[PDB]
């Protein structure tokens, strides 16, 4: 655990005291004859750093709606806000990830901080259903099911497979 | 910031949740559509690095006195105790320092754990105070003063300088 330098009030002495661990702050500088005592921060306070400091930093003001918190003002940290899953940060707020449509795919996943990008769907892949999560899916391999190609996919659908 | 898997009560999906921060245990985890959400250690536990864990560890028991405590039990570290400034640590409990008697000074500084060791002041040197805590002093060089030794010095008091 590191130190750090404090006058002494009553004889003017230039003490090196122990730092107090991150989460807490000093409560009582060491003294030539007894050690500093360190304190947790009080709720709504942080340090992030083993420090020599007197009172904790306060937090952040309350996430603003639909923001939510994805780290609490706790003793260690600061809070942390963020557009909640499936939304992603638009200058001011929170809009929700983009869906793509049937026959499109996700190419890259959204964030919270970047929409999702769709793409179509390359040939011999499909997608049957609206998300903003899922990709395109390759068709059933009707070749390896030692079965034939009964009806074509589409960029909507699987092929259907069969005999004859 | 790292990651923990969890099995998802409601559907068995085997999830990667975002670990908390030390000082704050995982009060929910996360599931499908929802953060994981982390709570400050309450007064009396710690945990010391991030992690997945549903409750914080209890801090271990106040110090017997005359022990006090290095550091508190705060969010991030249980309490730590020690023998006193001026104590060490000597089987059961605390222990005064040796005090080098006049005539003696301390070679090496005591600490929480191990006593002060005095030695004898060698030669030119002197101490004429008892303490735990000084070493022997050095003669005023009275040739470097202008002046001449009036009173030789001894191992517990200052040479006297002066001239004739």
Same mark, same amino acid.
Request: overall charge positive; glycine content about 8%; aromatic content about 4%.
């Given at each position: 655990?590191?130190?750090?330098?404090?006058?002494?009030?009553?004889?003017?002495?230039? &003490?090196?005291?122990?730092?107090?661990?991150?989460?807490?702050? @000093?409560?009582?500088?060491?003294?030539?004859?007894?050690? +500093?005592?360190?304190?947790?921060?009080?709720?709504?306070?942080?340090?992030?750093?083993?420090?020599?400091?007197?009172?904790?930093?306060?937090? $952040?003001?309350?996430?603003?709606?639909? #923001?939510?918190?994805?780290?609490?003002?706790?003793? &260690?940290?600061?809070?942390?806000?963020?557009?909640?899953?499936? #939304?992603?940060?638009?200058?001011?707020?929170?809009?929700?990830?983009? @869906?793509?449509?049937?026959?499109?795919?996700?190419?890259?996943?959204?964030?919270?901080?970047?929409? @999702?990008?769709?793409?179509?769907?390359? +040939?011999?892949?499909? $997608?049957? @259903?609206?998300?903003?999560? #899922?990709?395109?899916?390759?068709?059933?391999?009707? &070749?390896?099911?030692?079965?034939?190609?009964?009806?074509?996919?589409?960029?909507?659908?699987?092929?259907?497979?069969?005999? &004859?």
């Amino acid at each position: 655990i590191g130190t750090y330098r404090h006058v002494d009030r009553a004889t003017g002495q230039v &003490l090196t005291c122990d730092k107090c661990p991150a989460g807490t702050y @000093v409560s009582e500088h060491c003294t030539n004859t007894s050690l +500093r005592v360190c304190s947790s921060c009080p709720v709504g306070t942080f340090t992030r750093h083993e420090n020599g400091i007197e009172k904790c930093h306060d937090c $952040s003001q309350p996430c603003p709606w639909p #923001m939510i918190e994805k780290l609490p003002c706790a003793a &260690l940290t600061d809070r942390e806000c963020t557009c909640p899953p499936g #939304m992603f940060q638009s200058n001011a707020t929170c809009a929700p990830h983009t @869906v793509c449509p049937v026959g499109w795919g996700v190419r890259k996943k959204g964030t919270e901080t970047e929409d @999702v990008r769709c793409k179509q769907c390359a +040939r011999g892949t499909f $997608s049957d @259903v609206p998300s903003s999560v #899922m990709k395109c899916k390759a068709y059933t391999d009707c &070749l390896s099911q030692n079965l034939v190609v009964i009806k074509p996919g589409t960029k909507e659908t699987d092929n259907v497979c069969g005999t &004859l």
